[PDB]
């Protein structure tokens, strides 16, 4: 068969639906700025061949062999390694409290956007201004020293009361006009996966890669556009100094592992969901790479815009943000609206889409976590399934109200470097080091050729047993090391927050030995006897 | 220290229609909103409206939604009040401040003498 | 069109006294922290000046004979170091959404 281009359409923008999310949106264009633009871009495109993909082809093959859920995958290959599934559950559960909230910033400009004169436009007394130049041209305004545009006043005073927080110590109460804007969010999720049907069918055309290819226009508004010649010059710059010391690879280790998939259990019900593909070496690797192409386009459109703050403030790329967090998208997207023609109705249109990027992301996210546990109580969710379903929304709710306050932003970027970066990392190493040093890569060379027939490449072979497990484990060697320390909104840290930031990012880690110790005392026979009855895997 | 002259006493004829002036300078003219207060000779004060230069937004009290027009000027940095419909209650000291910088919205001690009209 | 009320109507003169004025907020609350709420001194025949703006923060060139208090619908105003010079009328004014009306003022005089 010739398979000619009439598969090529139905193919090629499916894998566009499955492969960009907010974490090639949104998180990725703040974390080439976090640590310099430039020098982030060439530690990518290296953690990605030798630390991603090889993670991201082994949990699909474990997902369409063993057809279970993440909880109960291990106790087909390794009993004692069901921690790792309760790691999942336990890191899922400070994402709902990191990554709902960014979908409440977003329906939020939905609601203050429907009047024609657009509040990003000006800082003309209406909510809290002051110290701020609307017109950097417009008006021949000359750009001083503190100084704040009205696209960053917008955020900083009217969605997230920074100033009703003195610091992290101190936090306000709970802000009423944002708290009823993730209400509506929850409702939509529960009114969701309440059925949950969706395996490969045409919902994902327009949930996803339909807001892909008309958020693509923003691209042709930043070439328009003044300072691009100066703004793309910044996300190119190869050279920097001691990108093998100083940390930056836990920049690229959090954020390739955000946005591919492993490491959050999602790609292990995914693989168990389906039926039997039998193009698994052939599907993951167009979607691997188009996941990093997907991200290069929207990493591209943020430092397009910023250039133009950089033109007209007479100041460096790197001076425009020095001290703003995770909040970059909603900034840049502020004023790129603005300074189009048609400035009302795309304001309605470029937030919507978003929010519809951002809902596959957790309607399908989910799936990590609610198939996986499905599997641990199989006589008992014929009564509730009514019951837990709900109950893992409001137990998320009301995790979520430490950083629904007015101190919003200094719990976001506490959950971000500490709660994302180092959990989701260990929990990956002994994924990897407990299906080969343990379980052993010959058993699983057996089983990849069961379901497709073709043999894994000997550049493959060598990265599940020692090249993965060491760039996964010189990180955090790097890590434990290094002091995490940054800075954000003009703000230095304080200290507690960094013996709190290790108790989150060991929170995860102290559930994988409560579960081998539970295995302990129950198991009769000799201390060297009780190990291997331990991991002998199951008899059917 | 922002000077911020006004106009003079004019007369009031029945029906008429008149043209304070507000003249500022050595401030940033397109910042901050523009006040219009009326006080009648013995009575308390009353809001009229403000204006944002730039041609940016009017908001009226209602009682001069369209009995009042305010004009702006970025060039010349002065204000224009347009009334219409004249009578005997309309006659009395109109001032002319200026808006806060931001946070507050108080007025910055930046008054004017009054264009009293009769 | 948010109405306000002051509910004195005029004062003695006493020198080192209490005296204070609230103000009417039926229908007004606060968005942003820092208190909607503005004072002001007006001497007869001389145009309106600040005294207190936000309710707690010392005015311009203003000493500290006044000083403001309160938080939510009744506000109060300090002035017990009592000045013989302080015969004037005060008003009181909101700064929420297109409602900026004033009070009915009260003034002072023995």
């Known amino acids: 068969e010739r398979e000619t281009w009439g598969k090529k359409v139905d193919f090629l923008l499916s894998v566009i639906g499955y492969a960009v999310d907010l974490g090639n949106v949104w998180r990725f264009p703040y974390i080439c700025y976090q640590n310099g633009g430039g020098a982030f871009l060439l530690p990518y495109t290296i953690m990605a061949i030798f630390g991603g993909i090889p993670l991201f082809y082994m949990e699909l093959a474990l997902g369409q062999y063993h057809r279970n859920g993440c909880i109960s995958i291990w106790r087909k290959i390794c009993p004692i390694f069901k921690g790792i599934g309760y790691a999942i559950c336990i890191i899922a559960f400070y994402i709902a409290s990191y990554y709902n909230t960014i979908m409440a910033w977003a329906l939020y400009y939905l609601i203050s956007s429907f009047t024609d004169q657009l509040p990003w436009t000006s800082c003309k007394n209406s909510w809290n201004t002051g110290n701020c130049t609307n017109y950097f041209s417009e008006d021949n305004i000359t750009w001083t020293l503190h100084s704040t545009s009205p696209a960053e006043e917008f955020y900083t005073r009217h969605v997230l009361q920074i100033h009703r927080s003195k610091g992290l110590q101190d936090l306000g109460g709970i802000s009423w006009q944002l708290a009823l804007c993730i209400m509506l969010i929850f409702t939509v999720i529960y009114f969701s996966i309440w059925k949950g049907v969706k395996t490969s069918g045409k919902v994902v055309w327009v949930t996803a890669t339909f807001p892909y290819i008309i958020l693509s226009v923003l691209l042709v508004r930043g070439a328009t556009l003044p300072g691009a010649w100066r703004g793309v010059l910044f996300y190119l710059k190869p050279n920097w100094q001691k990108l093998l010391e100083t940390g930056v690879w836990i920049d690229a280790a959090a954020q390739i592992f955000f946005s591919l998939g492993p490491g959050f259990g999602v790609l292990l019900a995914f693989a168990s969901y389906n039926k039997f593909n039998n193009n698994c070496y052939q599907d993951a690797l167009v979607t691997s790479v188009v996941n990093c192409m997907t991200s290069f386009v929207s990493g591209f459109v943020i430092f397009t815009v910023l250039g133009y703050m950089a033109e007209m403030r007479n100041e460096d790329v790197s001076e425009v943000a020095k001290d703003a967090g995770p909040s970059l998208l909603f900034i840049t997207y502020a004023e790129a609206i603005a300074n189009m023609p048609a400035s009302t109705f795309f304001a309605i249109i470029f937030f919507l889409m978003l929010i519809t990027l951002g809902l596959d992301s957790t309607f399908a996210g989910l799936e990590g976590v609610i198939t996986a546990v499905l599997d641990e109580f199989p006589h008992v969710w014929a009564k509730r399934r009514e019951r837990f379903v709900l109950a893992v929304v409001i137990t998320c709710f009301f995790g979520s109200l430490v950083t629904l306050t007015f101190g919003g932003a200094y719990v976001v970027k506490l959950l971000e470097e500490y709660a994302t970066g180092p959990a989701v990392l260990t929990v990956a190493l002994i994924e990897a080091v407990a299906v080969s040093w343990f379980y052993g890569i010959t058993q699983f060379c057996r089983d990849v050729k069961e379901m497709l027939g073709f043999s894994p490449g000997w550049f493959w072979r060598i990265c599940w047993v020692a090249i993965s497990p060491l760039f996964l484990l010189f990180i955090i060697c790097s890590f434990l090391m290094s002091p995490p320390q940054l800075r954000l909104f003009q703000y230095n840290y304080p200290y507690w927050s960094i013996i709190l930031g290790y108790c989150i990012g060991t929170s995860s880690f102290i559930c994988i030995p409560t579960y081998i110790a539970y295995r302990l005392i129950i198991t009769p026979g000799t201390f060297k006897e009780r190990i291997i009855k331990s991991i002998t895997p199951e008899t059917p | 220290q922002v000077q911020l002259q006004q106009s003079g006493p004019e007369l009031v004829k029945l029906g008429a229609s008149v043209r304070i002036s507000c003249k500022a300078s050595?401030?940033?003219?397109?910042?901050?909103?523009m006040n219009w207060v009326k006080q009648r000779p013995g009575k308390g004060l009353e809001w009229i409206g403000r204006?944002?230069?730039?041609?940016?937004?009017?908001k009226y009290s209602g009682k001069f939604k369209g009995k009042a027009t305010l004009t702006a000027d970025k060039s010349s940095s002065t204000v224009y009040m347009q009334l219409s419909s004249l009578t005997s209650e309309d006659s009395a000291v109109y001032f002319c401040?200026?808006?806060?910088?931001?946070?507050?919205?108080?007025?910055?001690?930046?008054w004017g003498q009054g264009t009293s009209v009769t | 069109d948010i109405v306000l009320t002051q509910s004195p109507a005029s004062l003695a003169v006493s020198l080192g006294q209490r005296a204070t004025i609230s103000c009417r907020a039926s229908?007004?609350?606060?968005?942003?922290?820092?208190?909607?709420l503005n004072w002001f001194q007006q001497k007869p025949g001389q145009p309106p000046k600040l005294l207190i703006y936000?309710?707690?923060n010392q005015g311009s060139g203003v000493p500290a004979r006044f000083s403001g208090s309160g938080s939510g619908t009744y506000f109060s105003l300090n002035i017990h170091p009592m000045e013989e010079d302080d015969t004037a009328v005060y008003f009181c004014?909101?700064?929420?959404?297109?409602?900026?009306?004033f009070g009915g003022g009260t003034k002072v005089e023995i």
């Open positions: 401040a200026r808006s806060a910088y931001g946070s507050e919205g108080f007025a910055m001690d930046y």
């Open positions: 050595g401030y940033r003219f397109s910042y901050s909103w």
């Open positions: 204006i944002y230069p730039g041609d940016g937004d009017t």
């Open positions: 229908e007004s609350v606060d968005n942003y922290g820092i208190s909607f």
């Open positions: 936000a309710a707690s």
């Open positions: 004014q909101q700064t929420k959404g297109v409602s900026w009306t």
